[PDB]
Amino acid sequence: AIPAHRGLITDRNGEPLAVSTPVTTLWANPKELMTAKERWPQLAAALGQDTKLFADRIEQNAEREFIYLVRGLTPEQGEGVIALKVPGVYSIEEFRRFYPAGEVVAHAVGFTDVDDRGREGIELAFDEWLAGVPGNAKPGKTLALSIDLRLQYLAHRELRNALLENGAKAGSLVIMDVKTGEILAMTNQPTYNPNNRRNLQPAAMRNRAMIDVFEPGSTVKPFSMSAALASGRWKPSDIVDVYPGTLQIGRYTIRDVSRNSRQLDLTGILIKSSNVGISKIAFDIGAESIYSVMQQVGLGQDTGLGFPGERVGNLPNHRKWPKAETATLAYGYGLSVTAIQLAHAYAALANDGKSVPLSMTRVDRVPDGVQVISPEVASTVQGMLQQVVEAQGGVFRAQVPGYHAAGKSGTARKVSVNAYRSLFAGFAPATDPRIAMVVVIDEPSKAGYFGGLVSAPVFSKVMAGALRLMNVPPDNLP
Numbered sequence: 001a002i003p004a005h006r007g008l009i010t011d012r013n014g015e016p017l018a019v020s021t022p023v024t025t026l027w028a029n030p031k032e033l034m035t036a037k038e039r040w041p042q043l044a045a046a047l048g049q050d051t052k053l054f055a056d057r058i059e060q061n062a063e064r065e066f067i068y069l070v071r072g073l074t075p076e077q078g079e080g081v082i083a084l085k086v087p088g089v090y091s092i093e094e095f096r097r098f099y100p101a102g103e104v105v106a107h108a109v110g111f112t113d114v115d116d117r118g119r120e121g122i123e124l125a126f127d128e129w130l131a132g133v134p135g136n137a138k139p140g141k142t143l144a145l146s147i148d149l150r151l152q153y154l155a156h157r158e159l160r161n162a163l164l165e166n167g168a169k170a171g172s173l174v175i176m177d178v179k180t181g182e183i184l185a186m187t188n189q190p191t192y193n194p195n196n197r198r199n200l201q202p203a204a205m206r207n208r209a210m211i212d213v214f215e216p217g218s219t220v221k222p223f224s225m226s227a228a229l230a231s232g233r234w235k236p237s238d239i240v241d242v243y244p245g246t247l248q249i250g251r252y253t254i255r256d257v258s259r260n261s262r263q264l265d266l267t268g269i270l271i272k273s274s275n276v277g278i279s280k281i282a283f284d285i286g287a288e289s290i291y292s293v294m295q296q297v298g299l300g301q302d303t304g305l306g307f308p309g310e311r312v313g314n315l316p317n318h319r320k321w322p323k324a325e326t327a328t329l330a331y332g333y334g335l336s337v338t339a340i341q342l343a344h345a346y347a348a349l350a351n352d353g354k355s356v357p358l359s360m361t362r363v364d365r366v367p368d369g370v371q372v373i374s375p376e377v378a379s380t381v382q383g384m385l386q387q388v389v390e391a392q393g394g395v396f397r398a399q400v401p402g403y404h405a406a407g408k409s410g411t412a413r414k415v416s417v418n419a420y421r422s423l424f425a426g427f428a429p430a431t432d433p434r435i436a437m438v439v440v441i442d443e444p445s446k447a448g449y450f451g452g453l454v455s456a457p458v459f460s461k462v463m464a465g466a467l468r469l470m471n472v473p474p475d476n477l478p
Contacts, residue, residue, distance in 0.1 A: 002135025003094050006116055008142045009109060009123070009130065011149040012182070012362045017109050018123065018130075020095040020116075024078025026069040030062050032088030039086045043069075046081045071114065072096050097123070101149060103191040104156045107207040108147055108183075108360065111194040120205070122360060125306040144362040146182035151175055154465040155185040162458045163189050163441065166450075170442040171421075172209040173458065174343040175466055178427060178436050180363040181347065181356035184466070186210075186340070208440070209339045210303070210310040212421075216342055217332035218257075218273045218410035218451070219425045219438075222349060222381050223297060224330040225266060227289040228281045229377040236380060239263045242276040249323040254279050254331075257449065258393075267384045270408065271391050275331040282330035287321035290329055296355065296372035297345035299337050303358050313337045313415070336415040343438040346407070346425050349385075350433035353378030382406055386430035395424070397456035400463045402474040404430035407459065409451030412440070419443070422450035424459045428467060429475040435466050 009018035026047070033040075037055075044054035047070045061067045072094055073081070082091055097112045099105075110121020117131065118124035122145060132140035155173045163171055175185040192204040206212070228234040245259020254275050261272055269277035282290060295301065300315030313336040318325060328334040337345075340358065348355040353373030356366065373381075385406035389398045395409045407426015414421065422441040427433040439455040439462075467474075 002137045003092070003116065004132035004134050004137045005139040006095055006097065006112070007130040007132065007140035010142065010144050011147050011152070012144055013148065014144065015149045016100050017105055017145065017147070017149070019098045019100065021098045022075050023072035023094045023096045024075055025071050025092040025094045026073070026078070026081055027090050027092065028058070028067055028069050029088045029090075030058055030064055030067060033058050033086070034062065034088070036087040039084065042084060043081070043086050043089065046077070046084060097194075099194045101152070102193045102195055104187075105147060105149065105152050106191045106194050107188050107209070108145065108152075108186050109194070111197070120308065121207070124308050125360070146177075146184060146359050146362055147186070148184045148469070150469050151185040151466050152187060154469070155187040155462050156191070158458050158461045159187055159189055159439070162454060166441070166454045168441050168443065168454070170208065172212065172339045172440045173462060174209050174339050174438045175462070176343050176347045176436045178347040178350040178433050179356070180366050181359050181369070182363050183340075183358065183360050184435070207307060207309075210305070210307045211338070212440070213311045213313045213336045213338060213415045214412035214421050215333045215335065215415060216299075216337050216410060216423065217412050219342060219408050219412070219423050220294060220299065220332040220335070220345075221270060221273060221278050221330070222385060222408055223293045223299070223345065224278050224282060224290050225270060225384065226349070226373050226377055226381050227293045228266070228285050229380055230293070230374060231285040231289055233284055234266065234281060236266045236384070239265055240269060240277045240280050242269075242272075242274045242280070245276065247276045247279060249327065252324045254327055267387050267391075270384050270388050271394050273408070275327070278330045279327035282326045283323060287318070287326040287329050291315065291317060293373065294329075294335060294345075296370070297348045298355065299341055299345055300335050301341070303340055303344070305340070305358055305360055310340075311338055313341065332410065333413065339438045339440045342423070342425055343436055346427055346436040346438065348372055349378055349381060350427035350436045382430060382433065385426065389426070389430075395452045395456050397452060398424055398426060398459050400428055400460055400467070402464060402476050403428050403467055403472075404475050405459075405463060406430040406433070409449070409456055411446055411449070411451055413446075420446050422453070422455045424451055424455035426459060426463070428463050429472065431475055434470065434472050435463065437463055437466070
């Protein structure tokens, strides 16, 4: 068994993220080692093993012709042991992974097990590509991720800082190229150092962006509005009366977060994030039109990325949608999603209504993608989301230094097989979008409206650095 050199994983610009490092494994023929017992204590010490524990192992395995003494010493230490020239003691050249960016890209890249086989992340998803063929040994193949390590560092730092400053324990941030479907960053907190998994807590190893399923709440109101503007029955200057901030449908009451409104135009329904206003539109156009937009932008659908235990969530269908179910779909409690799905959906909206498949590998030839929302409707909804960020009473903390930005805040409700998440989903620049981003901050109470307050500022700082690192021309003009 002659171990193969595992393929290099790089970022999209060739920066190393996972590198095969030479190590030396030692195995022994007991019966041959048995001829040199006065050497055993100097061998044991050079192995970092206990004199008597080492001797027992040789004696107790006297019946075997093969045992491992030690796996993955450094090549130096390996030479040190071999230079003792003890009978029965053979070396295998192995490879161990080094992760130059460590905790910063831990969940995306993942790690290898004792046998140098992928256990998590890309290491597992592309295991065959990376592994090559043991011996003639064929070396594994190089893989360039979609991840831009510069954006990844910025995302990791700003999400970590925001969580520490606001007492929060956990969260995620996804950045996508809306044109290419490329995941430019995916960071989760807490994180772990894949180069040192000794103390590693299972909590730190959760790939939240792909695994945590939640009712996305107000962040899907834009998809309800997209269905409205595609129906033929609604234009932006149309008015809905949402007074007095509540709507009774049989036994159920729809309640608005802000109840200071009567007439709202469709932009105002998104700025105020009125559940009554989006519900009244939903009753008029029918739940099926909304369900169809949400399905077409990938909400509650397989991502196709091959991450182990990535979740699909759920977009329930009905033959008949009663009023309560229609309303709860329209304002985001009738489905459950992951942060990756939500970012993919915002990417479609930002890309003038064209969905492009998700990729965690560098995209050279962009797929054709699917026109899921008309360019006219996508353009209209982009302008409405720019007002959500820019207009009076809007999400001003999402405003991006030097650019126009667009998006929607929300309170998500955790789904498990409750607890809450503070969301901000958006894209920039607002008039010619390039990047879509979702920030998820885990929260114990529902109140506070922490989407606008803690997630939005992370969006502001990360979107600003991302656009500049990508040389996107500022659209805040002199």
